[PDB]
Design an enzyme around this catalytic site. Structure first.
Site, short mmCIF file in Angstrom:
data_model
loop_
_atom_site.label_atom_id
_atom_site.label_comp_id
_atom_site.label_asym_id
_atom_site.label_seq_id
_atom_site.Cartn_x
_atom_site.Cartn_y
_atom_site.Cartn_z
N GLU A 1 0.84 -1.19 0.00
CA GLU A 1 0.00 0.00 0.00
C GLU A 1 0.87 1.23 0.00
O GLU A 1 2.01 1.19 -0.45
CB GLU A 1 -0.93 0.03 1.22
N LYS B 1 5.68 4.40 -1.29
CA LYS B 1 5.07 3.27 -1.96
C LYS B 1 5.95 2.03 -1.97
O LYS B 1 7.03 2.01 -2.55
CB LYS B 1 4.67 3.65 -3.39
N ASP C 1 -4.33 3.63 -16.70
CA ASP C 1 -4.99 3.44 -15.40
C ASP C 1 -5.70 4.68 -14.86
O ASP C 1 -5.68 4.93 -13.66
CB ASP C 1 -3.98 2.95 -14.36
O1 LIG Z 1 0.47 3.92 -6.77
C1 LIG Z 1 0.11 5.04 -6.02
C2 LIG Z 1 -0.96 4.90 -5.19
C3 LIG Z 1 -1.36 6.03 -4.40
C4 LIG Z 1 -2.50 5.92 -3.53
C5 LIG Z 1 -2.56 7.27 -2.81
O2 LIG Z 1 -2.33 7.08 -1.47
C6 LIG Z 1 -3.83 8.07 -2.83
O3 LIG Z 1 -3.60 9.20 -1.90
C7 LIG Z 1 -2.21 9.94 -2.10
C8 LIG Z 1 -1.17 9.34 -2.89
C9 LIG Z 1 0.08 9.93 -3.11
C10 LIG Z 1 0.32 11.18 -2.54
C11 LIG Z 1 -0.69 11.80 -1.74
O4 LIG Z 1 -0.43 13.05 -1.16
C12 LIG Z 1 -1.95 11.19 -1.52
O5 LIG Z 1 -2.92 11.84 -0.71
C13 LIG Z 1 -1.49 8.07 -3.46
C14 LIG Z 1 -0.69 7.13 -4.48
C15 LIG Z 1 0.43 7.30 -5.35
C16 LIG Z 1 0.81 6.21 -6.12
O6 LIG Z 1 1.91 6.30 -7.00
#
Ligand SMILES: O=C1C=C2C[C@]3(O)COc4c(ccc(O)c4O)C3=C2C=C1O
Ligand SMILES: [Cl-]
Length: 313
Positions: free
Chosen positions: A40, A50, A138
């Site tokens: 996650e 990540k 995606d």
């Molecule tokens: O593969 C992923 C998956 C997420 C899920 C997720 O966590 C959504 O929420 C986020 C975030 C990144 C920065 C951020 O500030 C935030 O709020 C996200 C990602 C970035 C990626 O490359």
């Protein structure tokens, strides 16, 4: 089949650009970043971390090379570093912090201006990466990050994004079920950046019609059937004929007679404000079976629908 835009982009570049199998990341000390909260992905010291999953090494290069290529992109999320854990020799991506506001809570309050704004911001992103030979594959509202106070946006998770080389055949096994375009559902490999424009479009439908998802298939076959109920089957069949596509036998007894509806079939009191015939023109030009028939990312930023957004730039 070929792309209407940016089709050679990579060919005109140093092999180093798009040959990610040849990428060699420097992995840093993740002890620079401690767990704060989980998404996650985790928040940290701000950043978001990540942890790359039981994934083949090849798939990992592709996502680092691409993030570096798109570093300095309009509305594209950015990579601060790639690291690993001392005890856990597993690879990790570390991104800029965007203060998220989950789309399900934030879509219901959008104004017919918020929508075009945030869609414009998406098209800024999609067009920029489409101009670098990368295609997303995606685009769902999950991967579209917004900050409604800040009115910022970032397109995220390039776990699946691939470089476009013309005439190359790709995995039809990508994207989420609802945002899969017809090319993926009929097993056609020779797709390109148009896919994201179907994705984006699909989201347009949701934003102005508040039917989320718009195309709510209950399996992967039904997802094409759900689309044939809007766009019509005859227009579907002609599309298959043109690209000489073998239609999987299971679609036999589940399509049949279906008619091009009117995009206006989807207006009601609760969404009335949010629809404008400019939304319903762009939208049509965006949701066409024929990936090539679809608007490019650029041509879209040109559609009237955004005249209210260009004006206040
Ligand atoms: O593969 C992923 C998956 C997420 C899920 C997720 O966590 C959504 O929420 C986020 C975030 C990144 C920065 C951020 O500030 C935030 O709020 C996200 C990602 C970035 C990626 O490359
Ligand atoms: Cl892939």
């Amino acid at each position: 089949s070929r792309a209407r835009v940016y089709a050679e982009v990579n060919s005109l570049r140093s092999r180093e650009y798009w040959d990610y199998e040849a990428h060699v990341p420097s992995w840093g000390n993740q002890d620079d970043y401690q767990l704060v909260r989980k998404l996650e992905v985790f928040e940290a010291i701000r950043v978001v971390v990540k942890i790359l999953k039981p994934v083949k090494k090849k798939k990992i290069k592709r996502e680092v090379k691409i993030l570096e290529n798109l570093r300095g992109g309009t509305n594209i999320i950015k990579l601060i570093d790639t690291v690993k854990d001392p005890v856990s020799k597993t690879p990790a991506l570390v991104f800029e912090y965007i203060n998220n506001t989950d789309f399900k809570q934030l879509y219901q309050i959008l104004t017919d201006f918020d929508i075009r704004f945030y869609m414009y911001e998406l098209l800024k992103a999609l067009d920029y990466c489409h101009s670098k030979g990368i295609m997303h594959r995606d685009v769902k509202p999950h991967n579209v990050m917004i900050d409604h106070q800040q009115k910022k946006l970032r397109l995220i998770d390039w776990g699946l994004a691939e470089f476009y080389h013309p005439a190359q055949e790709y995995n039809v096994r990508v994207a989420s079920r609802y945002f899969k375009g017809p090319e993926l559902l009929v097993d056609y490999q020779m797709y390109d950046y148009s896919l994201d424009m179907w994705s984006l479009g699909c989201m347009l439908a949701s934003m102005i019609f508040r039917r989320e998802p718009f195309f709510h298939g209950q399996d992967n076959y039904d997802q094409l059937v759900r689309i044939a109920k809007v766009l019509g089957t005859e227009e579907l069949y002609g599309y298959l004929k043109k690209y000489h596509i073998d239609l999987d036998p299971h679609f036999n007894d589940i399509l049949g007679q279906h008619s091009r509806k009117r995009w206006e079939n989807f207006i009601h009191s609760e969404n009335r404000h949010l629809v404008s015939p400019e939304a319903l023109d762009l939208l049509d030009k965006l949701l066409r079976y024929d990936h090539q028939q679809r608007l490019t990312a650029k041509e879209a930023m040109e559609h009237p629908y955004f005249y209210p957004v260009v004006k206040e730039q």
